[model samples]
Target chain A: SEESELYHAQIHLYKHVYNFVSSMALKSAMELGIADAIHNHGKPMTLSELASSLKLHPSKVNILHRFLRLLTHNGFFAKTIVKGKEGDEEEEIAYSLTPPSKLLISGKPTCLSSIVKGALHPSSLDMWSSSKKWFNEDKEQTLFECATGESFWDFLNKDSESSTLSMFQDAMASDSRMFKLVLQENKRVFEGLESLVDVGGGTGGVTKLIHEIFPHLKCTVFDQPQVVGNLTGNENLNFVGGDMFKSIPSADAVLLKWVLHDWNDEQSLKILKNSKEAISHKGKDGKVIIIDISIDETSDDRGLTELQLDYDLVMLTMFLGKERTKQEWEKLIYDAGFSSYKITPISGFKSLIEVYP
Target chain B: SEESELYHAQIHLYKHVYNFVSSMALKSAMELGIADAIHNHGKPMTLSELASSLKLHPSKVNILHRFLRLLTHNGFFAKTIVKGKEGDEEEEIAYSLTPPSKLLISGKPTCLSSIVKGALHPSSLDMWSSSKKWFNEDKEQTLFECATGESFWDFLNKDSESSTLSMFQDAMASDSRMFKLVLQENKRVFEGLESLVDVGGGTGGVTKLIHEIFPHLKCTVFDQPQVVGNLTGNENLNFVGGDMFKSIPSADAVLLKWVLHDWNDEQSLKILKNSKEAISHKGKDGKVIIIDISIDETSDDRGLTELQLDYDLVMLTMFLGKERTKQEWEKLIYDAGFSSYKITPISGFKSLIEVYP
Candidate 1:
């Protein structure tokens, strides 16, 4: 009996070790469009019926069912009782999606399924295997560069079918919807401004939200020509094709949202100088409304601050960039010749900084 | 800042997901004899010194160090402050084994290194990948059989190298040391027996322990020839190689330790019948003693019972065996024509079953 217990312990250890296969099988099911097929069926479908819909090998249906069992256990899918056709059996088992799987629907406006797909892609998963090597290597680049032998941006540009790029874009786009509320809550900031320039406003997603909230304010989206080339705009909301490094369009206020965190201090200072120059044209009315993650040591929001710091580390590892603490932001503002700044905590982990000339 | 907080959550998820790699790295270090190398150094070993002792690829040393950091955090190894050698100004760290790592020292009688090695081997770990297939296969065989396409016993027998087999045997040998205490505590079980037979006694380790405990008891190990043929026996402890179903050598009592769990009802009944025949030759005093795990039903020991039940399920999956409940044992005993049986809980998740003829 002691021997039996010993073997049992070994088996339990194996179970935990192998639990990753369940997640992998779930990923495979999502990739194979099994959820979509079952959703579109509009009724309870048997295993054979589902297999027929997917056009899979007959023998593989049982394999798929086994996978479904694991998924169902994890709450991705649910089983329902159904009346069998032709009276073959009074009741039969059928598959249906749960609330979590509902998020995987592709056509939803705020769908994160693509982001999930991209993150779990073989490219991203395999990079982790090189993490130890990356930490040991003297080259000092992130693990991603070590694993892929190329920067993430270069990889995206090289592979036209890199769905991860679009997935990331979609994720960002989904995130922008909540930013509209933040701007709405602080509408007084825009009341004093005659004009505003949105630096790095790719395809005008954030700028359009600002324009929609304040029709009287003139807004310009400044980004690379490749990003905003074909978009037609009204007189009030216009697109300016230019780089923020060299110069920025002159306006009463300069706006930079979710942009500063992507560049190092030196590069960020250059962009800030360009902003100062653009706003300097408006004399004393010149102000910069910057919305980004600001780590505030004085603020008692330890949880939010810790989260911001973690994000800063992620940016450092992934893109060699950093989200700045309040002190770092102050250093950048003063170094770039800004006289004063006011910080207002907006949303959970971000802040709106109004900088004066 | 909400965006940053969300990003932080994502980063945390990634860290936890990848934490298994640290454990794998520790297992790899053990396999590579890292601890042994440091122990042999006989003094505080520097990184370079330890690395040189291993004589691995130059590139592997840093990776090994990264792994060591993880293991140190997990408390398997300890790092201590140390000064660099003469002329070197920078401080250095030295490595040493902790209590758990000390148990991994090879050639020690109480060393559990072989058990860990056997449990972590690829053959044991990889069977988990086929768990889905196991559930869907519609067979009574185990997940191991499903994964390997052969029973574990057959696989062990067929492999020429049989690293897993040797590890298992070594683990058993290490376990044999514990029987000394069990026999010392329960000496009366063998006090009056003139002769006893150990069923399925591999290499006669337990039988040898019993013979030493009871010198007057003529012990005969009943097992397959391959096991008993190579094992020499003393005057009191002899070897009788044969199948349990066909016969058991005549003795006053029959001993079954960790063997009944390997068989289901019918097969076990056959062995019990043979044991009954052997024990019946000794008249009224004849008895069969079973040292195996039984489902303890007492309320206070519910946790232990649950653990035993889980062990039973694991045995069911691994070796197509099951630990029996009181009712199951009663049924088997009655079916095998034994008049009565008493189940006594043992120190571990085991029980002693005394069956009267």
Candidate 2:
């Protein structure tokens, strides 16, 4: 019985140990555009049909099946039994898009293929080879820096035509696009505001979405001078080139969408303090809208919590920043002199916070 | 409502996209010997205690907590709420080994940390970067060969001090050690055997274990001349050197444990034919014993099946071999002139088949 228990334990351990295989299989499917192939088919497609559509070599058919089996198990795709004609008992397995895999359909507004591509890219994963060393070493550099001898930010800017750069840019753009859905769903959050400033809003991605949704809400895209220098905006939209720690454009609400998580407590407090000042002139009605992840320990959404925590680590390894628990955020908000805050579950994994000065 | 549905779908996709993070976190924990640290502590260790035990930098304390949270969620580590002293409402979260993480304890009989180390090693994972290209290209070599221009075998044998080689050897040794538990668990499988030959078994790992358990059952470790050249065996165990393709030592039963899965159907058939011939002289009582993976489609253990399928793909990319489905196994066995076979679930993911001559 002990041996059986040990055997089962090894199985459990091996499952988690090889859990990366699930990720790699998903990455390969994205690279091969399997979802698109099935989507274009306009119906549940058989294995041979899917393989041929992807232009896979004959030898790789079984490989595709293995990948599909794992992905389907992970809930990316759905399988159906397609019965043969009336007299025939022959049945074939056909795969169709599940809601999750549908997000991988390229060119769709909800498409996240680029995000998957960017996160699983060799540059992102290769650095993990040195994670153990990074943990043991007394170096101040991040895991990415320790592995590649360059910060993740530096790596992105290292090559103009770098695939990593392109993938990351695509991922960021894809994320911004998702804000279209966010803005549409949470329109009330921005309805009462006459003006809003998006600190670190590079090239006005979020501001553009905000301006489009609420035409009367004047929006300012604030970032470093170099980033907003050449960017142009329309009547309700404008660009402000400045440092967030020092100053921000005055507005009814200072929108810090997905920005604070990229900063440490001290740096984030500085930005929050400046945000408080930016909205201080507006009196009691003014607030700072922070769009970021709020890790709720009591939340029933375990998968979403796992995602937020995983992203927190990603921030740590890549940006030397982190996602914060409610307590951590509360401490940072109070440390920055903000009186109180309210968190709203806006997106699935992220939340909308209204911080009052 | 549709927007909410879309958001949930995106969350699902993102989870799989970043699923590799789970594996990387586990690998990092293994590399840092977290399991060994907790086991050595002899108690449910607090976060600070774990950090100090690991000699981790103070800055890494939070990072370790982040990893522990995910690992605990995934059932790798067990968490307990340690009550504080009277008048203190706060409780400290202390961690202890679970059944899964227990296998990670070093130098234990069931230790599989080495397998995790070998499988997650950069050499093994980096090859996946080129999997997409390999699928499209009409190359005879495997994904690993396509990525590095070297076969997995050649890569392992290239250097003595190579980390990949050492990790692989460690994994192999750990697996061999698992057979001690296996033999003890399934004593009936080898009870009636007079003699058995472990085909492709090098250095007498399994054969020695077999000899130890069944002292009356003579066992021979058969492999390439170079592999068994310098190796010596005891009274009941012996080593023989020869090419399996050309000839095999005759015996009452042939044991092919985890061997056939490393070769394609054609090659496996050859080995199977030799196994049948080796047992041919013994007639009705003779059998060829196969201990390998059998992918059962109808089994209730979905997680175990997924693990088996994942390993099947690993074989595909790394060695161009594959684990067989029940249908595939049936075809191979019947084609090899075996009358019938019985599959018994051996170690959790593998099956032991007694193939009749």
Candidate 3:
């Protein structure tokens, strides 16, 4: 049993070492559009059908089969045996999508294929190889900046022709698509508001979704000039280019969705104060809504918390920003001079906080 | 409940996507020698002391703390509250080695730091970006070849001065050191042997250990000329330069430690036949001892199996070799003209097979 203990320990170590392979394998499948192929097939698909539909060469067929074997075991795909037709005396294996794989389908509202592509991009992975060097370096820079000599934000804010910027936008857009349901369930927050300013909301993917649920509320998509310029929208839903740090467009409420996590305490504090100012005209009725991760270190769902923590590292490595614990958030909120705030766990791992002045 | 189901599914997807971050964090810690620092500290280590001992810049101290936070959460390290001075009015968190982190320490018999370093090296992680391309290529090349246009063996065998070759040799050597315990437990397999030939025993790291256990038994480390040509040893322990495919040095038994998995069926069959030919002088008394992974696809320990599968992908990507299933092993043994064999699960994830001629 001592040998077993070491064996198990080795397994634990090796499993973590190669966990990336599973993620990359999933990324490859998403890029190959495997989930879309199965969905389009209208039934469980045979390997041959998948290969031909995907137009893979003969030599690659077995390799695809091997990938599916591993992918199926990882729970992304379901494998079944389909019996032969008529009196034929054989059966063949078939593949189908699981719910997770369904999220890779191209046209789906919840399609996070963009997240898969962007998060596992070479840029994301290559910077990791420098984490040690980053720690050793004297310059106060992110792992990304340490590796590339440029911030990931700078990489994304290049000319609109930048492929990385496009990739990143589509990624956030897809995740933003998942938030309509959040708005659907939490509409009461917007019930009394005549207008809402989405500070740092680039191109209004989330605001457009909010419009679907609350059409009468005027929504302003406020961001940097480069992010919102050349955008067109209707009377109630419009793009307003400006800096959230200096002054935010005034409205009954300020919506800071997916914004605060990208800025540290001091930086986020400034934005939070500006948000408070943006809604000051509404007096007691005014509010600033923050939607971001609220990490619970002792959560019963350890996997969910691990995912949140994993995300914190992503934020840390990419921008030196961080996802906060509830305690950290409380400190930030009170330090921003908010009179009161309410935290509501929503949309899986994210929390929505409404701060009143 | 429905929303919760989707939420859980999303968590599962994201956790896998970022699992690589944990591995990379561990690798960075390994590269930073965190385990070595803790091991040398002789007690639980406070973050401040650790940062100072590591000589990390003041800015990196917090980053190191963040990494330890994640690493401790992942079970590589154990965290505890250490009390300060009686009137200090302060306590600090300290980290101690867990079973897994112990494997990362340097100079230990079970230290597998080389495995972590070599396996997560940029060469290994970067080639994975080509998995999709490899699957679509018409050429029958390993993923490494597809990525780098050269075989991993060539990469390792560029010259005696090759860094990759040295790194890989140390990796196998560390894993080979663990086999001494396997030899301790399974000495019966090597009993009654007047002489033994270790086929494919590069540099004799394993054969040397086996010699320690069976000091009286004459041992020959048979490998390529380049591997053992410059080596020297005393009586009862020696090295021979030759090709196993051509023939092997005659002995009572042949030891094939971690060899066949680097070869496919036809190649392994050839080695097995030659191994039998080497021991033909002993007729029915001849045996071939194989030490490698024997995958249990349906094992109760799913993590163990997953690790095995991960290793399989490593072999597949590196050289197109593969770990065998029990059924695959049986086929290989019978096809090699072995009439019978005994398989015993040894040290950890590896199995020892005694094949009788």
Candidate 4:
């Protein structure tokens, strides 16, 4: 029994140690356009056919099979047996995109291939090696800054033609594309809101999505001056540049979608308080919509909660920000002087919290 | 619930994407000696107490708590409620070791901290960025070589005082210590063998353990000239330097523990053939003992299978080697001219296989 426990422990430990490989394999799948190939094929694709579609060299066919092998194990692909046509005896294995793999298909509204690429890129992973050094040091800073001698934002902004910044925008815009489904599902949350302000809404991606559902609702894309300086919009949908921490343009509701997760608790509280102030004119009728992770540690879906926690650490290390727990969110909301809040799980691990003033 | 399916898909995708953070978090724990502190305290430790033991800066205590929270969710630490001493009203949380976390306690024979360190080191992970390049290239080479422009072995060997080599040896040695349990459990495998040669037994860490159990059995640690040149042993336990593909010292049985996984099929088959020849004198009475991962893709334990698959890729990327499946192992064994073999699961994810000529 001790030996069995030892066996289980070793497997668990090794499983965690090798967890990165699964992520890396997914990145490989995304970069190789494996899902796109299968999608273009319009059916399950055999290994050689998939390789040929990807334009891989002869020596690399077997290598591609290995990647697919691991990705399939991680639930990225569906394996099917295909019998050869015309009475051929051989049966070949073909891979079809599973639900998860479908997210990696490029050119789809729900596709997250760019997000997968950006998150697993060396820019994010290389900073991890200096984590221990970051912890042991006296000064408090982001692990990215600790390793690279500059903040991740600086790294993104330094170059004249910053592809990294483009990558970041692409990832954000790609994620925003999925918000249409959530907005449709939770239509009741915005039914009565006459006006809305999207805080930190760069280029108005989510605001545009919101306008798709509620065409006449006046929405303001509130962010920094540089983000909105060159942007123009309709009378109902407009860009207004100012500091969020200082003051926000008044609206019946404030939308903080994927924004507060990039700030620490103190800064997040400041944003939430300002959001509350921006909606104060409506008194009890006013609401602030928070679209971020509300971590439920005891949730039935362990993997979902783990993903939220992982994002928490990613935020901590890269931006000195955090993903809040349900309790933490409640505490912050109450401290920001909101009367009540309700969290609705959305977009697969993130939560949509409706905060009433 | 198509929307629900999309949400699930997104979570699954994000979970795999964020899997690396769990691993990086573990490495940070090992580096900070979190487990060592808890193990030394011999009791549940509060966050501040742990920070004190680790001598961490006040600024990093919250950071330490964040890591511990994730690790605990990961089953590394057991969370407990500690009532404030005597009349104190506060009840604080403390952490104790779980079965998996116990493996991280340093100085224990079963300690795997060093293995965790080596496997998660920047050396193993940095090369992963070039996985796409490795997959697309025509050259037959490891990902490590594709990324670094040199083989991992060359990097290890070129250093005058190779800390990398020491790290590798320490990992191998740490893993070898766990073999004592398997050898004790499966004592029948070694019974009645008059003599045995451990092919590729570098420095004989495993061979020594084999000797500990079977002190009277004649054992030879067979490896390269440089590996065995300076080593000395008694008549019953000795070192021999030679090419296993060319010839091997005759023995009733041959041990190929953790050896074959580092070579491709062609090279591994050559070693197997020579192993058969070395034991040919005894015919059916002789056997070749193989201790390596016999990947069971359909195992009930998904985590175990995933770990084995992860190792397969680690081998594929780092050494151009592989962990064979049950069918692949069978084919390799039969191709090596062995008539039959039986695989017994051992040491968590590995298997001990007996090949009969």
Candidate 5:
């Protein structure tokens, strides 16, 4: 038992010391275009030539090798041996990009690299180190607000040089790709819906996808005036600028995707009440489609549980909101005077909650 | 195939963004002494109760919870559910120490917290950002040298306030506990030897351990005058001020533990030759015992490979030297005029190398 404890402790320390290298290695690989380079190379690229192709200084080749080794071990890349050229005797160590880095390639529509960069940026990191200070302060604002003296959104709007606003927009746009899958799996829910409203749909990423999937369904992208003002949409999907709490557009189905998770309970209830009023006009067909994280009680999957809990804490820290369990969702829907709600587990860490009015 | 590639890319990007949090979470858990506290608590401490026990601010409790969730996923702690007190309906989430965190308890000689501290220190991290600059600079020796305008060793030697030297010493001291395992497993190698010398044994952690294990075998801790001048040793283990490249005290066996990895082939060969000569004074029975990382060609174990290669890169970056493969070690030994050498994998990633004239 003593020996086992010692082994665990040593590993614990080792993991912490070695773990930072994983991130640093990823940063190095992204900067080197390692993923794209390997992807374009059409096969695994050898260490020597990969280094050479980077055009790095002669002294820095070893540094690149070190970086590659760490990343490969961490599963970001895979290692293989390629036969060397005519004069070379040693087998060249080649590396191939893994699926995760493929999402970082610059041109991909589903590229989440901007989100990764935004989240790991100094703008985000520096605020966290001051978290203790923020919590102790007499402010309802988050640590990000405490550090920057402004809300995260306000900072994004103000910092033109950083492009924080565009990065945030890109992240949401990337997330919108998942809506295609959501529509395919839940098509029946939209079968009789003649009209749909995407509440808080900034830039129309989700609403556009919904209209494309269900051509007969008319959709409206509703958000703050400033966000939807310059955007244009087709006949099937239109843009409407308004506050959700004040009023929501009349639609058979009202959608709230990742909206409630960004607000406190009281604020969310107000929006839900507005949704109930808007959907009441549709009579028995009225419903509210909520796409957010719902902590599954019976799921035995550890990875899913961790992901849900981790994201919940992120919301708590960054936006002072929290993810709710299935029961909590039921309570919220019932408290808002909704008749019934059903939760369906979607891809990744999200759930589809359809609440009947 | 396309689907797999996309999955890989998303995972890769996620790894990079979340990797830093791994280290930060570990650091927070260590700082909270969660391992020791939970160990002392005898049972797993519940989430809210752990928060209450930590006496952390209520607002900061969620941060701690988030931290624990990530750490538990990483295997630093185990999570369980315990029934709440009599009147409480809610079940409490409890945490217990995993094997890894047990080694970090304070007052343990085998404590590796300082090693983690040294590796994660701002001095080490701040220099990493200058790696690009280091590559461009012509005069600087390394990224560290470029960032600090001095070698890492020189920086430690020059600045009394830096705590760099103390940190380095503590790292080595903690590492010596591992050497005891080597002695336990390989006691036969030192049985017939009357005298043994530890080359570059700063602070004599190895020589003292050898003396403690085999008291009859006279041991000498040999290093530069600066390191050996002030430290006194017991009867069998005495400090000897000298340059290992030029000469070493005559001994039946010479121990070169973690020293040769800090030098290039030429310097290491010179030291090896001197070691051969010193041990040869005891005739054909003399041997050189080396405890360092040995890159095995047949070992297909990936985790071991990553660790050895990681250490190799650290040597390459920190000292401009490297951990060598089997063939490289053979070349060095043969080039230094040694007749034979044998390497045995020891203590996870390291090796016990025995060389003879």
Candidate 6:
């Protein structure tokens, strides 16, 4: 009985230890454009067809099959048993895009392949090797900085020609595109609001989408000078350059979408206070819209909660910030002098919180 | 409906993309010796206790909690609600070793933390960055070779001072301990065999365990000249140095434990053929025992299957080898001139196969 339990435990441990293989396998698929190839096929494609479309060397056909099998098991792709010709007794296994894999298809507003590429990039993953050194050392720099001798922010800014930077930018744009679905699904969050300010929004991707959807709501894209410099705006959308910690644009609601998770409670509270000030300029009825991950341990969606927690750790190691539990968020909001807050589940793993002054 | 489906799919994709975080978080825990610390604590250690034991910088205390939360969710550690002293309404979460975490405790006969450390090392994971190039180029080098400009074998041999090599050796020794459990669980598989030559077995880790269990059974630790050069053994267990490709030590049954998965079909077939010849020298009834992964997709243990598949990919990319499915195993066995084979599930993700000459 002990032997059986040990074996089972080994298997369990092996699963977590080797969990990166799933990520690497998915990364390989994204790199090989397997999802895009399947989409272009317009139907369930055989392994050979997928391989040829990918321009893979003949020797790598089986390798492609290996990747597809893992991806299919992980729910990225669906396998179907396709019947052969009328007289043929053989059947072939063909692969088609699952809804998750659909997001990997490029040239679409819903595409998230860039996010996968950026997150799985060597620059991001290589930092993990230094995490131990970081944990033991008394350094203000992040794990990424410990590994590379440069902060992630510095790496992004200094290495503008680097693929890592481009990948990060692409990831940001692709993530912003998700707001289309967010607005489509949760328009009630923005209903009756005439104006909004997107603090730290780079190049106004989210504000642009918000302007497209609402049309009547005047939106301001506020960020640092370099990020918003030379960016033009439309009738209802405008770009303003400033520091969020110093000052924020006044509006009916200040959108801090996915921002607070990048800073500590001290810095996040400062941003929250500034956001409240901006919203207060519009009156007491106005609220500060904080759209970020509110980790809920009691949520029924265990998988999503785990993802949020994983992202939280990523934030901790990659940046100096972290995702917060409900209590953590409440503490920060109240610490920032907000009277109360309502956390609404929106955008899947992220929550849309309305913080009242 | 589409919006909900899209949101669900996005969540699914995000989970897979971030799956590596699970592995990295586990790696951090291993590097930090969390399991060993908790085990040494001799009880369900609280967060503060764990942090103190790890000698963690005070700032990283919450960071430890972040990693622990993910590890706990992934089932690496078990959490218990420890009640505070009487009249105190406070409850603290204390962490204890689960069966899985127990395997990570150092100096244990079944410790596998080395395996985790080695596998998660940059030497293994960083090669994935070049996987895309590897798939497209026509080269005989493995993914590791393509990325590092040297084969994993060459890297190990050339860089004797390399931590990667040491880690890998530790991992091998740790894995060999699993065979002790294997023999205990499935004694019937080796009950009748009087002699066994452990082909490719290094330093007699497996053979030593075998001799301990079956003192009367003759065992030979067969490997390269360099590996078995100075190794000495007792009466039942002896060391033999030679190339398996050219010849093998004659025995009633040949053991190829975790070796076939490191070579391609042609190469594995060569070793299998040599194994058959070595076992055949005794009699027609002699068998060759294989302790390797026999992938069964139909098995109810989907997690184990995924682990097997992941290891299969690791073998494929790290070395020019792979784990075989039952069908593939059948072909390999039959091709090597074995009459028939029986696969017995012994280890959780691996199987013990008896091939009759």
Best by TM-score: 4
Give the TM-score (vs. native) of candidate 6. Answer: 0.82
lDDT per residue as tens, model 4, A1-357: 543357678778888999998988888888888888998999889987898998988888888888888899888898999877766638899999999988887777778888888899888999998998999999989999999999888888886638878988899877777789899889999999899999999889788989999998999999899989878869889899999999999999999987877788899899999999999999999999999889999888788778888999998898887777999888899999999998898876788999998
Question: What C-alpha lDDT does candidate 1 achieve relative to the native structure?
Answer: 0.68
**Model 3 per-residue lDDT tens digits across residues B1-357:** 353246556766777788788888789888999989988998999999899989999999989988898888888899889988698639899999888888888887878889889989888888877877887778988899999888877877777538887887899878767888778877788889999998887877777788889899998888999888988778988788988899999999998887887787899999999988899999999899988888877778776666667677777777776678878898988988889999887644668898997
lDDT of 1 by residue, B234-330 (tens): 7787887778889888899999998887788889899999999998878778999998887754435543554464445445546755567778888
- Cα deviation at B120, candidate 5, in Å, is 2.3
User: Candidate 4 — which residues are off by over 4 angstroms?
Assistant: A1-5, A85-89, A192-205, A218-254, A258-288, A333-341, A355-357, B1-5, B85-89, B188-205, B216-254, B262-288, B332-342, B354-357
5 or 6, greater by TM-score: 6
For candidate 5, the TM-score is 0.78
DockQ of each: 0.09, 0.50, 0.49, 0.69, 0.31, 0.59
**Better model by DockQ: candidate 1 vs candidate 4:** 4
Worst 10-residue lDDT window, candidate 3 chain A: A1-10
B139 in model 4: Cα distance from truth in Å?
A: 2.1
lDDT of 5 at B330: 89
lDDT of 2 by residue, B68-142 (tens): 987887778888988766886478989998888888888777778888888888888999889888889876778
* Comparing 2 and 5 on lDDT, the stronger one: 2
Which parts of model 3 have CA positions greater than 4 angstroms off? A1-5, A85-89, A156-161, A184-205, A216-255, A262-289, A330-348, A353-357, B1-5, B85-89, B156-161, B185-205, B216-254, B262-288, B330-348, B353-357
Q: For every model in order, what is the iRMS? A: 9.1, 2.0, 1.7, 1.0, 4.0, 1.4
For lDDT, the strongest prediction is 4
lDDT of 6 by residue, B255-356 (tens): 998898778899999999999889776778689998888987766877778888998889889887777888888899999999989988764577899999
Taking the tens digit of each residue's C-alpha lDDT, what string does model 5 give over B1-357? 336334334433554455555665565566566766776678888877676666677767776776786677767788788887788847778898766776666676555677666666555555555555665444537667877778878878875646778877787766777678668667889999888888888888677777767888888889999988988756787788988888998989999988887789999999999998998767889999887778754467655666566556556556766678878888999999889988877644678899989
TM-score per candidate: 0.52, 0.82, 0.83, 0.86, 0.78, 0.82
Residue pairs in collision within model 4 = none
Candidate 1 residue lDDT tens string, A1-357: 332233233222323233334334455565666667777886766777787887765545555665565456545677898877774866778888665554455665323455545544555445544544554465756557887898877876677746757777675665676577677778988888879998998888888899878987888888998997877668888788888999999998999988887788999999999999999878888899889988774557543554454344444445655567799999999999999999987644568999998
Regions of candidate 1 where Cα sits further than 4 Å from its true position: A1-357, B1-198, B205-220, B225-232, B235-238, B245-357
The CAPRI quality class of candidate 5 comes to: acceptable
Error of 1 at B271 (Å): 5.8
Error of 1 at B247 (Å): 6.1
